[PDB]
Amino acid sequence: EDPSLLEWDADDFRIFCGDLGNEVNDDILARAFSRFPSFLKAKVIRDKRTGKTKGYGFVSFKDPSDYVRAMREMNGKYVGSRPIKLRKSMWKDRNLDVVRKKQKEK
Amino acid sequence: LTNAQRSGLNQIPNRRFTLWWSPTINRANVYVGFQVQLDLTGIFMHGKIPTLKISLIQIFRAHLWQKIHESIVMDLCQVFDQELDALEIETVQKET
Amino acid sequence: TEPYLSSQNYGELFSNQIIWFVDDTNVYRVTIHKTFEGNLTTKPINGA
Amino acid sequence: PTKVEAHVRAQMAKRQKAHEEANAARKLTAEQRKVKKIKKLKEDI
Amino acid sequence: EEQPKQIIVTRKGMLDPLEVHLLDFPNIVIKGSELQLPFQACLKVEKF
Amino acid sequence: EEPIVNRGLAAALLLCQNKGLLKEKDGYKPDVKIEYVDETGRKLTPKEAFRQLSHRFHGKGSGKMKTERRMKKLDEEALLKKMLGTVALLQEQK
RNA sequence: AGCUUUGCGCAGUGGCAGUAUCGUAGCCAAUGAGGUUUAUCCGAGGCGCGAUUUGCUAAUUGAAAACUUCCCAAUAGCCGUGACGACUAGUCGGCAUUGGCAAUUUUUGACAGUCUCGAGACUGG
């Protein structure tokens, strides 16, 4: 249980962008998504002891109406130097895969 | 598929032909040497045979030469640890 | 090609490894029914 | 074999029950039939 | 747990399509049979 | 058809065989066994022995999802090989 | 008030799905498409071109199939022996580790099968 997932959630929806260029995009992704709609929090997973980007990034949007238009418009859109690929966030943490294992046997 | 993709799909059997006859085409008698060693692989390629370069790189992709040497070294030290005392060996040392 | 199930290899049918037999001969079967004046029918029937 | 299609039996009971729910609302309850029979029979004289 | 890992075809013209249709299960063994078993006798009993 | 006969072993062999469950050098025989195993002791397939070698070579193992599939696959083998007919007989209630 | 018809919409059971289902922005079409049957009769789409979303799960290759690891060192019964100690060369208690622990009194198995109404009998050829 990493103590960093708790900086986006306000029951808001997270888009998962991957296939991103590891030489850049630390705040380029925020720059690109900031036009729709306002100030938000968008991270990029750059792993420690290396400073290298692991690819994927999480942009947390205020609305699931905002989300559909953002996803449809910026799918494959040239961002830094690799076309971003967009999916929905998993967040399969403990309190949901316990429920999933309880739903397995039922 | 596109005309270029149909071209490449018909050059695939030339790739398997070149890879098949590689030990007698990629020798030094056949192409006088400008011996370019293949990258991260111990193969020398006498003559620029680019089809053979692609096939032998795709065989030895993902550092297979070093993995083969590492597996053979570690399996041989497994043999020498299995047969330590009955050859009068103190220990083995996997050299750096 | 695996050793076909002979009468000296069928003893391996009954160990812990679960084995199935698939007999597909009776899948497609017909009945050939005559009336004398007119013609002759063949009815495809169900199989297993 | 009874357990899995017992689950899906409860789920198809849920499905047929939801069909009967969507027929249960939007039903012309007891007097919406009466006002629609009235607006059928009472013309615009 | 109930899937087999050994399947025996009575009629020899079925193990070659069974090789194709069971590439999702490479763990299973598709052998032919030298002994054929009369499962048309199952058709002959009135219940089946 | 062979019973494991009380006071007898050889009928169990005829059962299991039926079921198919069977310089001045030193001067010696070095029985080299070259064997690939995981930590559990299982004899390892050469594809996955190379996979263990290459995980240790590259220093980067599998992801989380492929380890979930692989681990659940190994306990699928464990749950399968440690063993609905009685349930079918009880349902055949009609 | 009940029954009921037709068209449309919704959902549900089932069936079908490459001689199936459609799009057509190009043209033609009830001011008639298309007609060998019945033609002073029938009456609906036709020709071309072009197609046939989404979620979940499995399996494979691949080093890696994308949601924020390996390795080293050490710690976690009894008979002898060495000291320390206690009590009279002997005895006892605890501690420690430098050999051993399948041959009748124990911890490396006289057990296993059978039969009769909690109790006995038979066999191991």
PDB file of C-alpha atoms in Angstrom, chain F residues 4 23 28-29 31 36 48 51-52 60 70 91:
ATOM      1  CA  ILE F   4      -3.618 -55.517  -4.074  1.00  0.00           C
ATOM      2  CA  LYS F  23      47.958 -38.365 -15.840  1.00  0.00           C
ATOM      3  CA  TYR F  28      35.236 -43.596 -11.643  1.00  0.00           C
ATOM      4  CA  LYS F  29      31.915 -42.493 -13.121  1.00  0.00           C
ATOM      5  CA  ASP F  31      27.204 -38.952 -12.831  1.00  0.00           C
ATOM      6  CA  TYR F  36      16.782 -26.897 -13.527  1.00  0.00           C
ATOM      7  CA  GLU F  48      10.711 -21.315 -18.182  1.00  0.00           C
ATOM      8  CA  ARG F  51      12.718 -17.412 -18.398  1.00  0.00           C
ATOM      9  CA  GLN F  52      14.115 -17.586 -14.849  1.00  0.00           C
ATOM     10  CA  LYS F  60      13.557  -7.170 -14.244  1.00  0.00           C
ATOM     11  CA  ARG F  70       1.494 -17.840 -13.429  1.00  0.00           C
ATOM     12  CA  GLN F  91     -29.173 -34.927  -9.110  1.00  0.00           C
TER      13      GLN F  91
END
